[model samples]
Target: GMLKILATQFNGKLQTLTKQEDELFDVVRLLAQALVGQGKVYLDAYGEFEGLYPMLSDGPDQMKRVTKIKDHKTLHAVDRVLIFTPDTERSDLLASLARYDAWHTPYSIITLGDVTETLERSIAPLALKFDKGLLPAEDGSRHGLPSLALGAFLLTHILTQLQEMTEEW
Candidate 1:
């Protein structure tokens, strides 16, 4: 179809890079570098091209239900403990995070610069919750945030962006 024709037209061009293209590559490289600086990684169009925190909440549930997961009730007369894993469940709801983008999807949190860190830090206690127990026992066995599958995710996004750019020109 259209893909067959497009592939034939660009076959030769696809294999090369230009010296001037470094500017474009630098944009992506800077993105990677900035992410690395904060001990966080940035995913590309694969659900992250937009913003890290969505303007509205996601998932099949509403905000009130979401808040219930993290709130603690007074324990004087009656007491029951509850646990919540927000980041974990948030993974599935990030539809773009499906196979096309996700690496290990190891309950990864998007860490950003100091501003973002400070913002998330304020939200951390409430956001500390994730879909902790949802993974196979092995996935949950680890301690501390898992090393991000950054290279895998970023490189794929770069290749994707390049392919799109090739088509445009």
Candidate 2:
């Protein structure tokens, strides 16, 4: 019964994400722009979302021109940064976004909560409809959120779209 419940919940989450196709496409377009301009696309994640780093960097499906954001100073106007986080309230992340604004560096954020108006206005913001765990435990608690699995799904979708767009060139 637990496995069945988990599968149903996971499918629900997948369906919810599939419904946000337009918003996800916006992100793909943003990153595709950097690739088209011969600029690098930097990837970074915070907290639990950091699990995405390896998937984006070393995975078999890793895209071209994509790298980790090791040095913020090296980012330029043409480069695009993709940041993943479950929360957007971190001061460090906010400060980094401010710096990107000053440098005219474009970026897209994939997060889980509400995005500020300023962020939505300045950059591509794809907020996943994710919160809470997938399965409920006997003690009335929840577990198995599968945030990383969902993130990987989104990454694969973006990668496929990016490939299609770039191949048309």
Candidate 3:
């Protein structure tokens, strides 16, 4: 069954994904704290993270204040920012951050796949990578986003709680 296959794939590497436990908790706490202070949350689901858009938009509260991260000269100090990317190299996120001193803000760049040493040196406080490069795929392509759907799904639940605080809903 499709569901079985999905579950198996997710269950197998679930433990491995949590290896970065510190980063995960830090990201979660940063988000909640940001919302508590009525701060903005700029969410960017780039690359394969595009598939996660529906899940984020359709869940619990109306993200009317949430803005997409795109075409910008500079970014201000927002409460928190969460970016989902398979790889950061192709994204303008880093470039935009550089345009201004956005590193001063606390943010989490949650990677849904294996990453490399080429990560930019920025003040981004949290690096929430959920992939340990052991995920199963029939296509045999090992270096792509793995368990992106599952990671995003779980994160949506976490965001829903904080989102409520953001809007007082």
Candidate 4:
């Protein structure tokens, strides 16, 4: 079942994070702090990630502030954008968007798989890495793999932090 598989895979990778890497959660918490006032969280998803938008935008009450963005034209200097894509290295589109917000707006990129070196340099604390390595072939065919668990895990983590950081506001 998804529940079991997700728990094992997610927890397996999470358990290996070093103390330096664990500090990223605190960084995300700080970022959540910055989002308390007039700040906005702009979210964009690609491929299968598109289905998880509602979970990110409306998970609970506090995270409802999330807005779905179509392009970089809509982002303001004060807004923060989070990009969800399948493979960070395979897409230059998200990288290009991040490049646009490089100097002004703070943006985050969360890739389901391992983050590429370039992506690592682009967004550090704001990024969450899940290296689920190669998938097991099904029926000797490389099709129909389960992939929604990563999105589910991140949305839960990020929204809970946003909820906690902004609960008083």
Give lDDT per model, in order.
0.28, 0.79, 0.57, 0.60
Once fitted onto the true fold, the runs of candidate 3 whose alpha carbons sit more than 4 angstroms away are 1-6, 18-21, 61-65, 100-103, 115-146, 161-169
**Candidate 1 residue-wise lDDT at 30:** 33
Please provide, for model 1 over 75-126, each residue's C-alpha lDDT reduced to its tens digit, 9 standing for 90 to 100. Answer: 2211111112223234433432333123322222232112223223221212
lDDT of 1: 0.28
Clash count (model 4, backbone only): 0
Best of the two (2, 3) by lDDT: 2
lDDT of 3 by residue, 1-169 (tens): 7567656666655665567566555666666665555566667667667766665568564365555555543445655666677666764757544543444555566654444443434334334355444434687654433556655665665576567555574
1 against 2, candidate with superior lDDT: 2
- Give candidate 2 misplaced runs (Cα > 4 Å): 117-122, 137-140
- Candidate 4 has a TM-score of 0.69
- Give residue 97's lDDT in candidate 3 (0 to 100): 43
In Å, residue 74's CA in model 3 sits off its true spot by: 4.8
RMSD each, Å = 20.8, 1.9, 4.3, 4.1
Instruction: List the candidates' TM-scores in order.
Output: 0.23, 0.89, 0.66, 0.69
Q: Enumerate residue pairs that collide in model 2.
A: none
* lDDT (10s digit) by residue, model 4, range 3-85: 67656765655565434345456546534744766767766677787877777555553365666765545555666766677
Model 1 shows how many backbone clashes?
8
**lDDT per residue (tens digit) for residues 1-169 in model 2:** 8788888889987887778888877888888889978688887777887787887668876876876677636678898888877877788778878888887889899887666664574467987757578777898988888888888878777777777777898
**In order, how many clashes per candidate?**
8, 0, 0, 0
